[PDB]
Design a protein around this ligand. Structure first.
Ligand SMILES: Cc1ncc(COP(=O)(O)O)c(CN)c1O
Ligand SMILES: Cc1ncc(COP(=O)(O)O)c(CN)c1O
Lengths: 364, 366
């Protein structure tokens, strides 16, 4: 009977734990920023017909460079952001996680550093470590926004190889203005990855509008997992100068994107207008949830995403368990006093708010 | 926008002058270059896949099941049947192709300050993935017969104490199986882990290294794929069989939710049609014998193969020979080995086209 301790694991992996929210089958799941609406019937029927057409070629490797997918991603970005781009500017992988892994491999790695503004997406430092990129944590301000004076000073002092800016931010929900992003890009010596996972939830312009001005520095990361209602499809992408595609082609695993992954995303993309209509509904529920939390007595951080960061508990994890006891699974993001709730359909939000009303009285 | 190229980006130095891996994507009517099973998925498999997608597509807004437990159950059922070795989900791990399986194992057990040892010529992604994961690669030469020279192998493993040893069997590109006794000899001298890459195992009647897992639980990992005999390259599903402790190890390095909902569901569908699909192995194996025999009759040097491809020579310029095949409508693989090319076995009409071309080409003395 052997254990992990008996295998010659890398030392730095000893005592580490596998990443991911608990997979708990409770009634109300508001913990991973998924769009709560199921894919449309029209989208599903299109997917079914598409699989029926392409399934007879599943014995063959997929198209290695995902050209058709990249064409359709470029068409989306051109329409969505107003910045003319083509497949040459687009690159796709298995989730943002793989996009970010590839970028870290090409531009981070041993002897290099990535800088982020904490608290932000927990996979950023995890992926940095996983690629042997040293992570530099710069604190956001007391309002949970980027403190630009500290940000610019620390970038200037550390000269990081990569800077992450997540906007809208996970977990806090705030947008870093494009003017502020420009200030950061200008001091950053290497590349800046602007993680726009939640961009569709904000009416303000995409960092794609800065690509023409900063081609040697700026990569804009996007996903189909959130607003695009397609997390199960595992499709992340970036938009950048075509030089960046050449870069990641050197580190990507050959045929990293399956035939079905490509074909499914293409289908989802041609139903984007209908699917993304859900952003309107979610924004209205975000407003309602945030206002109700404030009415209840909670400290709520303003958000431009599909989630709300709120506090202030003495023991957030106890509060988290108290929601869970009530059938509501939200996210403990490892931040003192605070939890993160995803905006769901109205019935889910009501259940969350009902639980929140009970829980504030427990003074946890 | 200012006009720039890759030279203007702050790329890692070691990546300068590198080239993207992969056979050229040439639209030729006879493609025999990536070791794919040439038979299309069965009507019954496709119908099942279509129905399954109609059922699970309504859940694609959600992240997939992170640990692919059902898939791992069904891979474990397959391996138990296929190799005669009782395993469960606890012994199985899946990823997006063997390539990602190998990447993850290299991350957990290779990496900076560690080494991986291979017997060249073997699968060209072993050293590439090594480099990609900052694992130093040690190339040990196979013998004149393209098989592993065991004296040299055991000597170098003893001398170098590699963190990882790769043994590919059947070997790509040469096709030879390394006997389980020889694999056992390698495992016993290896100090870290040994990854036995059985990508082509289904094509050889010989026993799997899964039969050695009980005896060497702290060292042996057996890598497998659905891309070759399993007729599912487009599904990108690779996996390994090992002691459960290795699942624990790779869970520390795998990207969360690395396997999509459709990838898991499609692989499950494929697995339930395995007996029918893997029936094609019999025809492929006999066509391989026919193809290799004709190449020899024609006058080529052919390495005896137990896989779905044949490695043959001896050209003055194998790239010229490769272009001569291309010119005749037949795409095979230049595996970057002087004098030699590798042809995948196709359907009989494809194999006949390959052999017709080979008969013309030998007369050109290229
Ligand atoms: C900022 C941010 N970026 C990237 C991701 C990852 O998305 P994906 O599903 O595309 O891997 C997330 C959450 N999942 C996120 O919050
Ligand atoms: C020995 C070997 N291992 C692994 C692979 C990769 O297979 P997959 O399609 O599962 O990533 C190949 C493919 N050519 C191979 O020849």
């Amino acid at each position: 009977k052997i254990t992990l301790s008996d295998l010659p694991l890398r030392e730095e992996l000893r005592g580490e734990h596998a990443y991911g929210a608990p997979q708990l089958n409770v009634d109300i799941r508001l913990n991973t920023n998924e769009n709560p609406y199921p894919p449309s019937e029209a989208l599903v029927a299109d997917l079914v017909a598409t699989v029926d057409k392409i399934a007879t070629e599943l014995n063959r490797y997929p198209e290695r460079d995902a050209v058709e997918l990249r064409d359709e991603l470029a068409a989306y970005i051109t329409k969505q952001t107003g910045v003319a781009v083509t497949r040459d500017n687009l690159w796709a992988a298995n989730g943002s996680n793989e996009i970010l892994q590839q970028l870290l491999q090409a531009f981070g790695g041993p002897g290099r550093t990535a800088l982020g503004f904490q608290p932000s997406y927990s996979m950023h430092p995890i992926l940095a470590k996983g690629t042997h990129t040293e992570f530099i944590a710069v604190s956001r301000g007391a309002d949970f926004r980027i403190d630009m004076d500290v940000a610019l000073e620390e970038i200037r002092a550390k000269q990081p190889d990569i800077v992450f800016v997540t906007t809208p931010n996970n977990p806090t929900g705030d947008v870093t203005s494009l003017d502020d992003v420009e200030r950061i890009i200008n001091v950053a010596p290497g590349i800046v990855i602007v993680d726009e996972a939640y961009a569709e939830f904000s009416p303000s312009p995409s960092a794609t509008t800065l690509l023409e001005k900063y081609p040697t520095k700026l990569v804009v990361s996007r996903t189909m997992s959130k607003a695009f209602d397609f997390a199960g499809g595992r499709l992340g992408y970036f938009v950048a100068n075509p030089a960046f595609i050449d870069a990641v082609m050197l580190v990507r695993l050959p045929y990293h994107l399956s035939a079905l992954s490509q074909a499914a995303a293409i289908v989802a993309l041609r139903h984007s207008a209908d699917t993304l209509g859900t952003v309107e509904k979610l924004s209205v529920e975000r407003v309602r949830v945030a206002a109700r939390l404030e009415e209840l007595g909670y400290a709520v951080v303003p958000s431009e995403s599909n989630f709300v960061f709120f506090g202030d508990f003495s023991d957030q994890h106890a509060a988290w368990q108290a929601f869970l006891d009530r059938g509501v699974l939200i996210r403990d993001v490892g931040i003192a006093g605070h939890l993160r709730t995803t905006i769901g359909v109205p019935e889910e939000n009501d259940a969350f708010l009902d639980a929140a009303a009970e829980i504030i009285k427990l003074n946890l």
